[PDB]
Each structure stands twice: as structure tokens, then as C-alpha cells.
Amino acid sequence: AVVASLKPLGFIASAIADGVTDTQVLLPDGASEHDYSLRPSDVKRLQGADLVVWVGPEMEAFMEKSVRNIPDNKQVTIAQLADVKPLLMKGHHHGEYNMHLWLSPEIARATAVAIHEKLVELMPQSRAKLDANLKDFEAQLAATDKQVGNELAPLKGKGYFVFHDAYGYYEKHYGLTPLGHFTVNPEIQPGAQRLHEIRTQLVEQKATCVFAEPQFRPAVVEAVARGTSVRMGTLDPLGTNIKLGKTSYSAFLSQLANQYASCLKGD
Ligand SMILES: [Zn+2]
Numbered sequence: 001a002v003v004a005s006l007k008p009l010g011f012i013a014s015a016i017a018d019g020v021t022d023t024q025v026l027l028p029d030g031a032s033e034h035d036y037s038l039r040p041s042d043v044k045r046l047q048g049a050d051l052v053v054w055v056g057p058e059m060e061a062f063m064e065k066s067v068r069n070i071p072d073n074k075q076v077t078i079a080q081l082a083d084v085k086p087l088l089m090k091g092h093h094h095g096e097y098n099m100h101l102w103l104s105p106e107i108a109r110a111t112a113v114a115i116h117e118k119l120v121e122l123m124p125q126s127r128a129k130l131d132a133n134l135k136d137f138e139a140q141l142a143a144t145d146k147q148v149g150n151e152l153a154p155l156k157g158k159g160y161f162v163f164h165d166a167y168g169y170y171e172k173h174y175g176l177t178p179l180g181h182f183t184v185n186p187e188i189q190p191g192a193q194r195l196h197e198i199r200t201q202l203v204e205q206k207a208t209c210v211f212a213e214p215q216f217r218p219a220v221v222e223a224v225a226r227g228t229s230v231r232m233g234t235l236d237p238l239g240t241n242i243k244l245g246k247t248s249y250s251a252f253l254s255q256l257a258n259q260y261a262s263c264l265k266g267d
Pocket of ligand 1: 033093166
């Protein structure tokens with residue numbers, strides 16, 4: 001099987017590995033980024049994988065050590081790909097670059113190409129199927145790119161805030177106009193002073209929307225938007241409800257577009 005660290009990397013892998021080998025995701029969604037504590041069983045799965053796919057040590061830091069013992073021809077480390085260097089954007093995260101790389105359609109393409117290359121070397125008997133899969137992935141990516149772009153085009157100029165500084169890759173690519181982000185605990189609303197400052201910025205900068213993520217308590221989001229003119233939305237950067245499969249990455253980009261539009265559309 002191909003073992004991907006995070007769900008959206010699984011979406012990409014599952015397009016390329018379709019009908020060749022299974023794709024598995026290592027991490028449950030609710031422990032995604034940087035905190036997770038790998039179990040011995042997870043390390044076993046990594047070592048047994050046909051191919052491991054992950055962003056790299058500045059994202060899934062918890063798996064860096066486990067991957068040292070996996071041969072280079074059995075891993076794709078997305079942030080280290082030669083073609084990914086000109087695609088990186090400046091941004092707990094704490095590094096210099098935005099490492100939410102799966103939100104860039106161009107980095108997704110580079111990732112698919114890297115996965116395809118490694119699998120063809122590992123499984124030459126399946127080259128034709130792997131080639132067909134890459135062709136289908138790229139065709140869908142092109143079609144989705146066009147659909148999403150047109151759906152988000154009328155929403156340009158409409159300001160909003162987010163609670164997670166992740167979306168830059170997707171926003172820049174499709175021409176959305178974010179006003180910025182607030183650091184907000186998903187379980188506990190900010191204190192009196194900081195809540196005042198946030199609510200003031202929401203009104204002053206003329207935000208249409210503020211976007212939370214699925215793990216945020218509705219009450220925390222309501223406390224942020226209370227008093228302001230601002231509509232509340234939800235973005236899901238992991239596509240948690242989308243099942244792995246051939247069309248999943250395209251479904252993910254399309255869903256994220258729907259989530260932006262659901263809130264930003266109208267007035
Ligand atoms: Zn993050």
C-alpha cells in the first residue's frame with residue numbers, strides 16, 4: 001500500500017495508485033499537523049509501505065525520525081521535491097514557509113508526478129496503469145481548476161478573516177482576498193481585551209466573513225462574530241468527509257470552493 005501522512009495527501013496518492021495498490025492514511029484527522037505521537041504500529045505500517053508520502057520535517061515533525069530508516073526510493077517528501085521549491089509561499093507552525101502544501105493545486109500536481117515516478121520504478125509491471133492514472137489525475141485537476149476558478153472569481157474583493165493561517169496556497173491561486181487571521185483557541189474564547197481587538201478589526205476592515213474550522217466550538221466562533229456584521233463560515237483544510245479514491249482530490253478542491261462561496265456569496 002501507499003501510506004500517506006495526512007488525508008489530502010491520501011487523496012492525491014489514491015488517484016495515482018488506483019487499481020494498483022491500496023492507499024492508507026496514517027493520521028486521524030483530529031491530530032493532523034504537528035502534535036501526534038506515533039505508535040509502534042504506525043512505524044510498522046510506514047516500514048511495510050510500498051511508498052510513504054508526507055510533506056516533511058517542518059510539517060509532520062513527529063514522523064521525521066521514523067522515516068530516516070526508509071529508503072529514498074520508497075518515499076516522497078513533498079517539501080523537498082525539486083519542482084516544489086518555486087511553488088512554496090511564505091507563512092503551531094513556527095517555520096518560515098507555509099507547509100500546508102496540499103492546498104496548492106500546482107504542488108498537488110508535482111506530488112502526483114513524484115508518486116507516479118516512484119511507483120513506476122517500484123512496480124514496472126503496472127507502468128501502463130500508473131501512466132493512465134496520472135493522465136486521469138491531471139485531466140481532472142485541469143477541469144476542477146477551471147470550475148473552481150470560475151466559481152470563486154465573482155468573490156474577489158470580498159474580505160474575510162480565518163482562524164488558521166493555512167489557506168494561502170489556495171487563496172493566491174484562485175484570487176480570493178483574505179484580510180488576515182486571528183489566533184483563537186477552538187475550545188476557549190479569547191479574553192475580554194483580545195476579543196474586543198478582534199471584533200474591532202472585523203468591523204473596521206469591513207470583513208464579509210470569518211471562517212472557522214470543523215474542530216471549533218460554535219460558541220467560540222459566535223463569541224468572535226457577536227456584535228459585528230460578519231457572517232460565520234467553516235473551512236475544512238483536510239476534506240475530512242471525503243473518502244479516498246480516484247476523484248477525491250478534485251472533490252476536495254471543489255468542496256473547499258463551495259465552503260468559501262457558501263459564506264462569501266451575496267450580501
Ligand atoms: Zn496548520
